[PDB]
Design a protein around this ligand. Sequence first.
Ligand SMILES: OC[C@H]1O[C@H](O[C@H]2[C@H](O)[C@@H](O)[C@@H](O[C@H]3[C@H](O)[C@@H](O)[C@@H](O[C@H]4[C@H](O)[C@@H](O)[C@@H](O)O[C@@H]4CO)O[C@@H]3CO)O[C@@H]2CO)[C@H](O)[C@@H](O)[C@@H]1O
Ligand SMILES: OC[C@H]1O[C@H](O[C@H]2[C@H](O)[C@@H](O)[C@@H](O[C@H]3[C@H](O)[C@@H](O)[C@@H](O[C@H]4[C@H](O)[C@@H](O)[C@H](O)O[C@@H]4CO)O[C@@H]3CO)O[C@@H]2CO)[C@H](O)[C@@H](O)[C@@H]1O
Ligand SMILES: OC[C@H]1O[C@H](O[C@H]2[C@H](O)[C@@H](O)[C@@H](O[C@H]3[C@H](O)[C@@H](O)[C@@H](O)O[C@@H]3CO)O[C@@H]2CO)[C@H](O)[C@@H](O)[C@@H]1O
Ligand code: NA
Ligand code: NA
Ligand code: NA
Ligand code: NA
Ligand code: NA
Length: 981
Amino acid sequence: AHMASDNYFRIHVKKLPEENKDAQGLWTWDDVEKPSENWPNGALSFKDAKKDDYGYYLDVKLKEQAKKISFLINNTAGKNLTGDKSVEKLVPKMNEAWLDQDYKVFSYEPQPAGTVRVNYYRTDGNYDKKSLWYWGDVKNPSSAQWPDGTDFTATGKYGRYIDIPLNEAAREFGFLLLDESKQGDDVKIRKENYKFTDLKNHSQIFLKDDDESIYTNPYYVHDIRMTGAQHESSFSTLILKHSNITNIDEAGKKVTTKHPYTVSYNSDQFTTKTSWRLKDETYSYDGKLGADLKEEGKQVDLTLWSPSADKVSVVVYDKNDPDKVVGTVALEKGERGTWKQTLDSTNKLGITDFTGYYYQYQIERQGKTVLALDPYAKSLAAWNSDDSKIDDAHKVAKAAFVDPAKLGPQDLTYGKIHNFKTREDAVIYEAHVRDFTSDPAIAKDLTKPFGTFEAFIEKLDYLKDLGVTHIQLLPVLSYYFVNELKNHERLSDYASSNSNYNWGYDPQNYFSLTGMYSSDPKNPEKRIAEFKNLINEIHKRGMGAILDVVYNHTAKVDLFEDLEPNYYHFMDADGTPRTSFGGGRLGTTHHMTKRLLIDSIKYLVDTYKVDGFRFDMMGDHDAASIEEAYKAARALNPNLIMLGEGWRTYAGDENMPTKAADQDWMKHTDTVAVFSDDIRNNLKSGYPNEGQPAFITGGKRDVNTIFKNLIAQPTNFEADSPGDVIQYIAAHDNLTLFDIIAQSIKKDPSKAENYAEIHRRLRLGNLMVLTAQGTPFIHSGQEYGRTKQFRNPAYRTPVAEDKVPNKSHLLRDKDGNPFDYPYFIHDSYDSSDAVNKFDWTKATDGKAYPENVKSRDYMKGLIALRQSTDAFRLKSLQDIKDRVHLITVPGQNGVEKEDVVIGYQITAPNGDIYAVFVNADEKAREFNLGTAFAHLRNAEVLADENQAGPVGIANPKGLEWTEKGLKLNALTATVLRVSQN
Ligand SMILES: OC[C@H]1O[C@H](O[C@H]2[C@H](O)[C@@H](O)[C@@H](O[C@H]3[C@H](O)[C@@H](O)[C@@H](O[C@H]4[C@H](O)[C@@H](O)[C@@H](O)O[C@@H]4CO)O[C@@H]3CO)O[C@@H]2CO)[C@H](O)[C@@H](O)[C@@H]1O
Ligand SMILES: OC[C@H]1O[C@H](O[C@H]2[C@H](O)[C@@H](O)[C@@H](O[C@H]3[C@H](O)[C@@H](O)[C@@H](O[C@H]4[C@H](O)[C@@H](O)[C@H](O)O[C@@H]4CO)O[C@@H]3CO)O[C@@H]2CO)[C@H](O)[C@@H](O)[C@@H]1O
Ligand SMILES: OC[C@H]1O[C@H](O[C@H]2[C@H](O)[C@@H](O)[C@@H](O[C@H]3[C@H](O)[C@@H](O)[C@@H](O)O[C@@H]3CO)O[C@@H]2CO)[C@H](O)[C@@H](O)[C@@H]1O
Ligand code: NA
Ligand code: NA
Ligand code: NA
Ligand code: NA
Ligand code: NA
């Protein structure tokens, strides 16, 4: 059937990870015909899986020469149930694999424990008197009269076979292949014993004819074999005799003219590829790159780096119908592997003004042609990935000839940001352009199309009122999996997968803006004007703009492989691009990839006059690239700030370690800050253990650990500067603060009392964050209690396993009972506007939602408070150790080592004394002041259980002053200030 086919692959499954097969699917990537898309339900469902004696199997179409098939089993939920799996196709006809009940992968059907199957294949097909004589770690060794061994009678897939019962923990056995039609010694097919050493790992072995080797796969490939060559050979495991070449590091499994060589070990032959490093020696190019539109549109200077190309032409498409090809113009060689051309009045395209015309690069290598996107494109044709299968032209976007300087508000320059002098002074607010205005409640209010750069301007006053200094925007650079032609359609049904909505972490280009937030994606110029406008309006309200940027990976390997093969990405030994979600991992240590990142940073700073960047998965990069970027950015805007995700994720090029730009980098630089998961996890929980009780959610924590985090000394990386630390409890990733608090305390928000309690804890957390040292970061909607509850009317109670929303948690109360509408989305990257909308009514309408608006005013107060004195934003570790002192010290005045209370004092530079007291407990708690802190009784109260700000509260609520000190009501924090003035 498909087993009589060159390009099908059968994956067999011992047991499905979960109970219901209707809710599970086989997700595939790498060398398959159609890699699975639309997580999770685009997976091949087990609903229709056929079944053999072993279990379920599924067949997958291939795309020859297919070598690597990757797969996993997911669910509707859609968790990655098995974890990622991978099979290498050993020979062309290896068309089957098996997953065991431990999700290990075999090239043969695994046999039950306590059994080794012995497979013997004979080219001559004569098994008549063929038998096996065996001994060792087996139950019943050959005991009869020699040479009466066990007959080979059963015929299988790989010759005849014998099943041998094993002992427990079997490790070694020995055997002889016999031909009992012979006499004396000639009954031994090979005279010398066979010994198999590896019964712990294999339940089948494979023998043929009189071959001495004991094979571990049915394709008779040896254990030691070559896998790559450069220019040092990749091996499977670990010579002079068998190696050849024309035209010994075993722990790393490795063995060690300007044109390709040919290397072979026995039977496996490899064409050599150039190291990226060699490429860099000869082609490292530092001149201008891209399409620069000059002479008022009448000329274009093109430069593309493509060293390995034979020919390069620009294909020019019509400004009014991008499908129409106008013509082609050959590029000529330039310096250092570039290709160049000047398009001017001399063109044979019938073009006078090039502005708004579109283009791709037709690249010819070894007689094969591809269409590639200029990595330096400044805008793009309207993009729809749903049309990517139409032809080569639709596989990647078309670039546009544009001139950004001329577009948008001409007065545009860097922000002059209120209450901001250094990185400790910033208050970062993280918003998605679409979320911020997609709430249908404001539809009649908006004058611009919703969810766009320009609609965003209409709600900037809310943010100015809030007091934030820096608006961090989720990716506005072009991303792939999106239909921009549908950007004005409202995504009003609840859904958490298969949506046109995208957060933007699928990068297509690093210079062009996405058309998704444009009023007109078909106009390549409008998005530039619109964005420059948004940025200008942000500045004119005394704020800055920070751009989430995603250099760590692209959406598709082809985007950069088709420009120049085996260079731009991080790669394995063989030179295979390292990948992430089907795209390439960009190798920022490679000269031209490094300059891609830096040129981009420089270009977006100069063009859009932005005030900083947030690096997605920054730990994926080398530290040097990021520091270089910081320098280059600052040379243009000396007030610019950077931050990133410094998780410890560096992979890099195989066998090449580099200092990564992660949390550990902080002890060596005072430039780019990192997110502090230590504070996040300690106060409320975090990935991957969401909902674990923690400091503001009923879970006592180590009091010193809390204090350290509050002075910007997280306990999991060294911060020698408080500006190194981005302090946060919520972000676009994971559950919202409101949602995680409800999850953690197991209280359903649909009981009004629970709603009240969650908001108390929410204010608490926000207080702790906004009075902490370092740089506070606020997830958009964190101020009002934003929710991502899944409120589809059919989802009021738990649903069938095959209807569970993608990336949801089912929240339960104390009795284990589902909340009302128990599903909450914790990863909303592919969720609709119903999930993702910023709720404007909850944020602003005090009569309809007193509690939500009370929390919003609380935030606004905390930001004013923070801005009123430098006490909370001290500029050095040393000063922080001078000025900040723990009042509730573990082991004194009966202060427990772990608790849900804390108190401390700051002596500000101007001599004012500030104190922060937090009672996250469910009863009144007393803070012992002693003699040392008696002066706090003189304080004005700046924050209580109802409100916050820099002006003293006349009638403070939730406080009682006692003999010992100060007693806070349950779920109460206070900020105190004493001014000896
Ligand atoms: O496809 C993979 C997943 O992608 C998304 O996961 C996100 C998380 O939601 C983010 O929170 C972040 O994860 C960080 C994490 O915040 C950070 O604390 C750190 O966690 C480490 C921890 O330090 C270490 O001690 C140990 O416990 O391992 C943890 C890793 O699990 O590092 C994380 C990054 O590795 O970023 C990830 C990746 O984008 C998405 O939400 C998921 O649904 C999805 O499965
Ligand atoms: O197709 C091959 C890949 O298959 C599997 O990957 C799937 C994930 O396991 C699954 O969670 C989901 O992944 C999405 C994330 O949940 C979502 O958060 C986002 O991830 C972003 C991330 O937020 C950002 O920080 C990072 O830099 O970019 C990520 C990618 O855009 O989108 C994810 C991708 O859709 O779906 C995946 C299938 O597409 C295997 O686990 C994976 O190893 C394979 O490569
Ligand atoms: O466990 C005890 C025993 O095991 C092994 O003996 C095996 C021999 O090594 C192996 O060659 C085979 O012996 C047969 C001869 O090859 C054959 O010419 C003729 O003489 O019959 C022999 C078997 O009776 O099989 C035995 C296992 O039966 C191990 O190697 C020995 O050292 C050990 O004594
Ligand atoms: Na092998
Ligand atoms: Na509308
Ligand atoms: Na850690
Ligand atoms: Na939030
Ligand atoms: Na100041």
